[PDB]
Design a protein around this motif. Sequence first.
Motif, PDB file in Angstrom:
ATOM      1  N   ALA A   1      -5.717  -6.502   8.548  1.00  0.00           N
ATOM      2  CA  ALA A   1      -6.436  -6.205   9.632  1.00  0.00           C
ATOM      3  C   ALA A   1      -7.344  -4.687   9.071  1.00  0.00           C
ATOM      4  CB  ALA A   1      -5.343  -5.900  10.824  1.00  0.00           C
ATOM      5  N   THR A   2      -6.740  -3.925   8.595  1.00  0.00           N
ATOM      6  CA  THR A   2      -7.277  -2.892   7.937  1.00  0.00           C
ATOM      7  C   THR A   2      -8.321  -2.888   7.308  1.00  0.00           C
ATOM      8  OG1 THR A   2      -6.962  -0.600   7.162  1.00  0.00           O
ATOM      9  CG2 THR A   2      -5.451  -2.229   6.555  1.00  0.00           C
ATOM     10  N   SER A   3      -9.449  -2.047   7.008  1.00  0.00           N
ATOM     11  CA  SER A   3     -10.411  -2.393   5.967  1.00  0.00           C
ATOM     12  C   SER A   3     -10.774  -1.137   5.192  1.00  0.00           C
ATOM     13  CB  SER A   3     -11.656  -2.974   6.717  1.00  0.00           C
ATOM     14  OG  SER A   3     -12.477  -1.916   6.971  1.00  0.00           O
ATOM     15  N   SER A   4     -10.359   0.202   5.736  1.00  0.00           N
ATOM     16  CA  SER A   4     -10.708   1.413   5.237  1.00  0.00           C
ATOM     17  C   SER A   4      -9.655   2.248   5.620  1.00  0.00           C
ATOM     18  CB  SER A   4     -12.169   2.074   5.695  1.00  0.00           C
ATOM     19  OG  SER A   4     -12.635   2.633   4.409  1.00  0.00           O
ATOM     20  N   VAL A   5      -8.953   2.724   4.883  1.00  0.00           N
ATOM     21  CA  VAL A   5      -7.875   3.901   4.923  1.00  0.00           C
ATOM     22  C   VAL A   5      -8.037   5.124   4.336  1.00  0.00           C
ATOM     23  CG1 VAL A   5      -5.409   4.165   5.233  1.00  0.00           C
ATOM     24  CG2 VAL A   5      -6.084   1.827   5.295  1.00  0.00           C
ATOM     25  N   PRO A   6      -8.597   6.180   5.019  1.00  0.00           N
ATOM     26  CA  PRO A   6      -8.925   7.348   4.394  1.00  0.00           C
ATOM     27  C   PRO A   6      -7.521   8.145   4.085  1.00  0.00           C
ATOM     28  CG  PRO A   6     -10.167   7.299   6.482  1.00  0.00           C
ATOM     29  CD  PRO A   6      -9.127   6.381   6.457  1.00  0.00           C
ATOM     30  N   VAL A   7      -7.416   8.569   2.654  1.00  0.00           N
ATOM     31  CA  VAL A   7      -6.110   9.294   1.986  1.00  0.00           C
ATOM     32  C   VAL A   7      -6.711  10.535   1.546  1.00  0.00           C
ATOM     33  CG1 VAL A   7      -5.453   6.909   1.360  1.00  0.00           C
ATOM     34  CG2 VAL A   7      -6.717   8.127  -0.058  1.00  0.00           C
ATOM     35  N   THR A   8      -5.398  11.292   1.180  1.00  0.00           N
ATOM     36  CA  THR A   8      -5.344  12.369   0.669  1.00  0.00           C
ATOM     37  C   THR A   8      -4.567  12.402  -0.400  1.00  0.00           C
ATOM     38  OG1 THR A   8      -3.873  13.383   2.391  1.00  0.00           O
ATOM     39  CG2 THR A   8      -5.945  13.675   2.706  1.00  0.00           C
ATOM     40  N   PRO A   9      -4.705  13.158  -1.426  1.00  0.00           N
ATOM     41  CA  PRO A   9      -3.899  13.199  -2.734  1.00  0.00           C
ATOM     42  C   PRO A   9      -2.511  13.990  -2.263  1.00  0.00           C
ATOM     43  CG  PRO A   9      -5.997  14.047  -3.308  1.00  0.00           C
ATOM     44  CD  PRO A   9      -6.065  13.953  -1.784  1.00  0.00           C
ATOM     45  N   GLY A  10      -1.271  13.308  -2.770  1.00  0.00           N
ATOM     46  CA  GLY A  10      -0.180  14.018  -2.573  1.00  0.00           C
ATOM     47  C   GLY A  10       0.532  13.466  -1.335  1.00  0.00           C
ATOM     48  N   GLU A  11      -0.156  12.469  -0.447  1.00  0.00           N
ATOM     49  CA  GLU A  11       0.291  11.793   0.750  1.00  0.00           C
ATOM     50  C   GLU A  11       0.668  10.327   0.409  1.00  0.00           C
ATOM     51  N   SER A  12       1.654   9.915   1.204  1.00  0.00           N
ATOM     52  CA  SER A  12       2.299   8.659   1.088  1.00  0.00           C
ATOM     53  C   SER A  12       1.449   7.701   2.291  1.00  0.00           C
ATOM     54  CB  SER A  12       3.696   8.679   1.425  1.00  0.00           C
ATOM     55  OG  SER A  12       3.907   8.714   2.792  1.00  0.00           O
ATOM     56  N   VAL A  13       0.888   6.653   1.672  1.00  0.00           N
ATOM     57  CA  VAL A  13       0.209   5.745   2.483  1.00  0.00           C
ATOM     58  C   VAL A  13       0.699   4.123   2.483  1.00  0.00           C
ATOM     59  CG1 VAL A  13      -1.914   7.126   1.978  1.00  0.00           C
ATOM     60  CG2 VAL A  13      -1.719   4.967   0.540  1.00  0.00           C
ATOM     61  N   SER A  14       0.502   3.615   3.453  1.00  0.00           N
ATOM     62  CA  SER A  14       1.045   1.946   3.412  1.00  0.00           C
ATOM     63  C   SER A  14      -0.072   1.088   3.945  1.00  0.00           C
ATOM     64  CB  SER A  14       2.054   2.010   4.501  1.00  0.00           C
ATOM     65  OG  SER A  14       3.014   2.971   4.444  1.00  0.00           O
ATOM     66  N   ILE A  15      -0.093  -0.061   3.135  1.00  0.00           N
ATOM     67  CA  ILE A  15      -1.120  -1.232   3.263  1.00  0.00           C
ATOM     68  C   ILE A  15      -0.411  -2.286   4.085  1.00  0.00           C
ATOM     69  CG2 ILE A  15      -2.777  -2.434   2.350  1.00  0.00           C
ATOM     70  CD1 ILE A  15      -3.795   0.058   2.414  1.00  0.00           C
ATOM     71  N   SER A  16      -0.964  -2.831   5.035  1.00  0.00           N
ATOM     72  CA  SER A  16      -0.351  -4.062   5.351  1.00  0.00           C
ATOM     73  C   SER A  16      -1.470  -5.426   5.361  1.00  0.00           C
ATOM     74  CB  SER A  16      -0.351  -4.243   7.222  1.00  0.00           C
ATOM     75  OG  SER A  16       0.896  -4.686   7.600  1.00  0.00           O
ATOM     76  N   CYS A  17      -0.539  -6.533   4.955  1.00  0.00           N
ATOM     77  CA  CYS A  17      -1.312  -7.795   4.766  1.00  0.00           C
ATOM     78  C   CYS A  17      -0.389  -8.795   5.392  1.00  0.00           C
ATOM     79  CB  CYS A  17      -1.416  -7.906   3.300  1.00  0.00           C
ATOM     80  SG  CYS A  17      -2.060  -9.655   2.717  1.00  0.00           S
ATOM     81  N   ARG A  18      -0.960  -9.812   6.047  1.00  0.00           N
ATOM     82  CA  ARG A  18      -0.321 -10.474   6.895  1.00  0.00           C
ATOM     83  C   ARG A  18      -0.799 -12.237   6.480  1.00  0.00           C
ATOM     84  NH1 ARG A  18      -0.620 -11.856  11.698  1.00  0.00           N
ATOM     85  NH2 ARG A  18      -2.586 -11.121  12.094  1.00  0.00           N
ATOM     86  N   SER A  19      -0.030 -12.971   7.006  1.00  0.00           N
ATOM     87  CA  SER A  19      -0.158 -14.571   6.274  1.00  0.00           C
ATOM     88  C   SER A  19      -0.066 -15.253   7.506  1.00  0.00           C
ATOM     89  CB  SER A  19       0.872 -15.034   5.316  1.00  0.00           C
ATOM     90  OG  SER A  19       1.968 -14.702   5.423  1.00  0.00           O
ATOM     91  N   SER A  20      -0.879 -16.580   7.683  1.00  0.00           N
ATOM     92  CA  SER A  20      -0.749 -17.515   8.861  1.00  0.00           C
ATOM     93  C   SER A  20       0.780 -18.240   8.639  1.00  0.00           C
ATOM     94  CB  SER A  20      -1.521 -18.434   8.692  1.00  0.00           C
ATOM     95  OG  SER A  20      -1.567 -19.532   7.810  1.00  0.00           O
ATOM     96  N   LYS A  21       0.980 -18.525   7.451  1.00  0.00           N
ATOM     97  CA  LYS A  21       2.274 -19.334   7.136  1.00  0.00           C
ATOM     98  C   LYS A  21       3.435 -18.456   6.451  1.00  0.00           C
ATOM     99  CE  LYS A  21       1.993 -23.096   4.480  1.00  0.00           C
ATOM    100  NZ  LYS A  21       1.903 -24.344   4.193  1.00  0.00           N
ATOM    101  N   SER A  22       4.688 -18.574   6.710  1.00  0.00           N
ATOM    102  CA  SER A  22       5.545 -17.626   5.976  1.00  0.00           C
ATOM    103  C   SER A  22       5.686 -18.087   4.504  1.00  0.00           C
ATOM    104  CB  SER A  22       6.848 -17.989   6.695  1.00  0.00           C
ATOM    105  OG  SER A  22       7.807 -17.302   5.935  1.00  0.00           O
TER     106      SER A  22
END
Lengths: 7, 293, 228, 343, 59, 232
Positions: free
Chosen positions: F128-149
Motif C-alpha cells: 500500500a505504501t510507496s514512499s516513506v520518508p525516513v531520518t537517520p537513527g529512527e525506527s521505520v516499518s514497512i508493510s506488505c500484504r498478500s491475497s492468500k495466506s
Amino acid sequence: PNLPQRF
Amino acid sequence: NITYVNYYLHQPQVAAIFIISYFLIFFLCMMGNTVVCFIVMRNKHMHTVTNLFILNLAISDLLVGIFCMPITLLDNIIAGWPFGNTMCKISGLVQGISVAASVFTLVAIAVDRFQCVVYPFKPKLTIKTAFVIIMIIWVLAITIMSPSAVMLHVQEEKYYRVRLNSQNKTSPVYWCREDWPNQEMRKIYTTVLFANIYLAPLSLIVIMYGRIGISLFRKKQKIIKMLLIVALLFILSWLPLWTLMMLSDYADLSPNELQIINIYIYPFAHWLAFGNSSVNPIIYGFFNENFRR
Amino acid sequence: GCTLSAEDKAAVERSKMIDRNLREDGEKAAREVKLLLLGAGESGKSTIVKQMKKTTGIVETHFTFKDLHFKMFDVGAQRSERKKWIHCFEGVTAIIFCVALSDYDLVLAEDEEMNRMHESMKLFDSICNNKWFTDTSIILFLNKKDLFEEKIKKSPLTICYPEYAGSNTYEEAAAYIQCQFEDLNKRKDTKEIYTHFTCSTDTKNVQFVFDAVTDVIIKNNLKDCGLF
Amino acid sequence: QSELDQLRQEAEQLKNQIRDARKACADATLSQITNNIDPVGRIQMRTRRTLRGHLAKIYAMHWGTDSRLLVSASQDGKLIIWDSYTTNKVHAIPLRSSWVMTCAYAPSGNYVACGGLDNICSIYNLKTREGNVRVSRELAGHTGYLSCCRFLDDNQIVTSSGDTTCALWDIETGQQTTTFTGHTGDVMSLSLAPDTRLFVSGACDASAKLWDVREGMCRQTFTGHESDINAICFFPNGNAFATGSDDATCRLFDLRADQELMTYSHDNIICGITSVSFSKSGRLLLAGYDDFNCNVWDALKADRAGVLAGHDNRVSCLGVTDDGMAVATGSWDSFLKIWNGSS
Amino acid sequence: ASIAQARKLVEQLKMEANIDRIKVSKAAADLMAYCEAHAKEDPLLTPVPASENPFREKK
Amino acid sequence: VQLVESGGGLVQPGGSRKLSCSASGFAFSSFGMHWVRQAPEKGLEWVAYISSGSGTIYYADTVKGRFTISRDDPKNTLFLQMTSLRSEDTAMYYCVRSIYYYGSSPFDFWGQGTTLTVSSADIVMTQATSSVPVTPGESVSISCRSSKSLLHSNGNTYLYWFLQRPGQSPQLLIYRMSNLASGVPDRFSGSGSGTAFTLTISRLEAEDVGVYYCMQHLEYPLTFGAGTKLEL
C-alpha cells in the motif's frame, strides 16, 4: 475321435 | 456305422496305469511346489532377486499341477470334456500358458546363472530388472500361446458315439478339439512353436550352461553335475512331445498307428512333459543350499 | 493432493539427486576389490607393499591390474586391541598374509625362547579361525625364500619344528612349513588358503594375487547367485 | 624393587580405603527406594519412519539441537545428513577414509565431525557460501583409532581414541589443548554433561572415568564391570550415567555416591550392548544389543519395558532427540529407523 | 623404570580418595525426584496425541 | 561468489537474443538458478527457474513458450534463449541463485544484471505504501500484504524481503519472514501472522536507503510487490 490336448 | 465306442476309453485294469502314475506325479508336483513357495516366504534372505525366478518356476509348476495334468487325466480314461466348452477352453489355455511359462523361466534362470559366472564382475540385475523379466516371460507365455486359444471351442464328433456306462447305450461324443476355420495354416504354426518352445530354449540352455562349464574349470562337482542333469532333463524329457505333435502336421501315420500312438503312447508323452514340471522343484531346491540351510 | 510447497518439491529433487550419486558411487565401489594386509612386524610386509604397488593408521595403497582396481589396506600401525577394529573388515575379499621364512631360526625381540615363526603361526590362528572371517580366503605369501635357502643349509629347521623329520633342503623344509601354516584352518569347507612363495622378481607375484582374487570373486558370485 | 613394591602396597591400601568409604556410604540399594513407585506399562514403540540410502554398515549417528536433523556414517565413505520429518537427504559428505567409527553434530548446527581408523577427527563446515561441505580442520595427533567425538561448542571438540587417551581440541588452532590420561585400555565411548564441564569415558579395562574439562584431571573412577565398556550416556540431570558392556549388562552409576546403583541384565540376554541413551525424563534407559533389537529398560526398576525389534543385523547406533519426541536406531543393515510411542 | 608411573598412580589415588560422598539413599531420592518432576513431559514415556506428534504416519 | 551476465543490448522487436550468466566461486551444479527482471523504474518480475540437475523448469505466464532457459553445469554458465521480443520485455535481467533444503537461504545471491532494450491464481502482492520518508537513527516499518495466506501446513511462511540500493543488485535481508540472512545486521527484523507482514528497521542509517521488495514462494508463479522507496 480324439487328438490329445496340445501340451 | 456310427462309431459306438465304450465310455471307458481304456481297459478298467489298464486305466490303473493312468490313475496311479498321474497320482504319483500329482502328489509331488503339488506338495513340493507348495513347500518351495513356503521356503521363499520363510526367511529374509529369500527376499533376494533370484528367488523371484525360482518362484516364477514354482508358480508355473503349481499351475501345471493344478490344471494341466488333471486336464490330460480326464482326456485319457474318459470320453469328451464333460465340464462344457467354456471350461475345456479355459483349461486348455491354462495348459499352454503353464507350459510356455515353464520353458521361458527355464531359459531365464539359465540366463541369470550364465551372467553370474561367465563374467565375474557384473552388475547383473536388481528387483526391477528381474521383475520385468518375470512379467516378460508371462506376456510371452500368453502371446506365443494366443494363437492356441485363438481357435479351440468343441468339435462335436457326432459321427462317433459312446456306450454310456449306465446301460452301454448310444451317447454322441463332443471332444474339446480345435475348431480351426483355417486348419491348413496351422500345419506350420506347430512348426514355429516347435522351434520357439523346444529348440530355441534348448539351444540357449545348451550354450549358457556349456559356457558356465568351460568358464568354471578355468570340491564343487555337485554343481557341475547339476548343470548336466538339468540340461539332460530338458533334452530328453520334452523330447518325445514335440516329436509327436510335429508328426501330426508332418508325415502322416497309418490309421492303426495313429490310433495306437494317440491312445496309449501320447499319455506317456504327457507324463514325460509334466515330468519336467514335477522334477523342477526337487532339482532347483535341493541343488541349492541357500534353501537347504 | 500433492500437499508439498515449492521448497518441499525442490528438497525432494535434491534428495533424489543425492540418492543417485550414492547409487553410482556404490556401483563404482562394488567393482573394486578390497584386500587386508595382515602379518607380523617385518615379515616381508615392505617387499609385498613395493611389488604389489601422516598419522599411524590405515595405509591404503591402490593398484590396478587388467581393469580390476584394488584397494589394499595395511593396518599394521594400529597398536590397539584387534577385536575392537577387525570387525570393520567384514566384506574384505582377501586377508593377504605375509610370513617370513627366516623367522624359523630367529627369536622374538622379547627373548623367551619364543620363535618368530611360531608367533606368525599364532597370529594366523586368530585370523583364520576368527568369528567374522568365515568366507574370506587368505592369500598367504611365504616371504624371503632366498634367506631360508641359505639359512637351511646350516641351521636345521628342527629348532623351529622339532617333530619335522625331513631333510635340510629347501624343498622338504618349505613343503613342511607350508603344510603347517595351511593345516591351522578348521573351516576348509568354506574358504581356502592360497599359498605362494614370493619371487625375487616384482612381476609374477601380482599375477598370483590377480588369479586368487579372480577365483574368490567367482566363488562368491556363484554362491550368491545360488549353485551351492 | 623395594620402592616399586612399596608403591604397589600404597596403591592397594588407597584402593582398600576407597572401597571401604564406598561401602560406608552404601546404606540401601536404589531398587528398595524405588520399590514403591508405580511401574510403567508396556512401551510399544513402533517404526514411524525408515531411512534408506546407505550401502554399508552404519556405525554412528547423532541428533542435532533442533531434534530434526540427524547425521549418520556408514563406512561407505559417506556422511548423510537426514531430515527426520520428511526422510529427505539434506547433504552427502564424501569421506576421504571409508573407515569412520564415530560421528558428531555441533550444538550450533554449523559443523559435523567424524573419525575412525585414520586417527583423524575431520571437522566439516555445513554453512558455507560455496554451498558444498568443506573440511574446516583435520585434527591430528592421536596414535590410536578414534572412537567417539562430541562437540562442546563451535570451537572445541572432545575426542576419545584407542591409544588409552582422551583429548580436548581447539578447532581454530588445531592443537590438543589438554590430554587426558589414566586409562589402561582403549577408550571406546564418551558422553558430555548437559552443563558441558564434565565428561565420562568408558574404556576396555572395564572402568568408567569422570574427567574435568578445564582442570584436565580424572576426578573419580568407576569399576564393577567384567568386560569392555562399549557405550556411555549421562542422565539428563547430570548426577548419574549409564554404561554398556560386552558382558550383556548395562549399569547405572551415581556421581555423588561414586558407586554402583543398579544393574540392568536379563537371563535371556547374552549379547553385549553397543549403544546406550537415556530418554528425556530419564525413566527409560534405551540400550541397543547385538541380538538385532534395542531393549527399553526401566531406569528405576530394572524391568524390561519393551523391545524394539525391526533390524536384520546388529544395532550400532542410538539417540533420543533433545525434546524426547523420537528415538533413532542405526544398525549394520544400512538402515536408520525412527521410533515413536504410539498414542 | 615405572617409578614415575607408580608415583603418578599413587598421587591420583590419593586425590580420588579425598572426595566427599553422599549416601546412596540421597542419590536415589534425587533420581526419583527428577524422574517424577519431569514426567508427563517425555513423549516416549507418556505418549502424546497424534495431533501434536510430528512423526505421525498419517502426515 | 561472483556472477556476471552478458549478451544484452538494443534489439529490433520480433528478433531473438541469448543471455548468459557466468558462475564462479561456488558449486553451480548444486544450485538452482532464477531469472528476475526489473522494468525501468518499475518493480521486479520473475522470469524463469531451472532446478539443480535440470529436473524441473518453470516459467512466467507472460513469457511461457518464447523463453528457453537451460544450464551447462560443466562450464558453469546459465543461459536464457529468448525469441519474439515485444516492447514489454524492456528491462534489465538478473541472474539469481537459490538452493533449497532445510535451513537453506533461497535467493541469497543476486548477479549484477545485464540490460535489454527494444525499440489469476498468482498470489497478488500489495504494498500500500510507496514512499516513506525516513531520518537517520529512527525506527521505520514497512508493510506488505498478500491475497492468500502464505502460512503453509508445515509451519513455514514463504515471504522474502529484498533490498535494492540505488545502482546495486538487491540483497536478501529476511527469508521465510523471520530468519535473517548471512551478512545482514541484526537491526532488521520481520513479523506477521498470515497475511499482513511487517519489517522493522530499528536504528536506520546510511546504506539502508533504497527500495524494499516482498516476494512469495508458496506457488511457483512468484509475484513481487510494487516496492517501497525509502527517502533520506
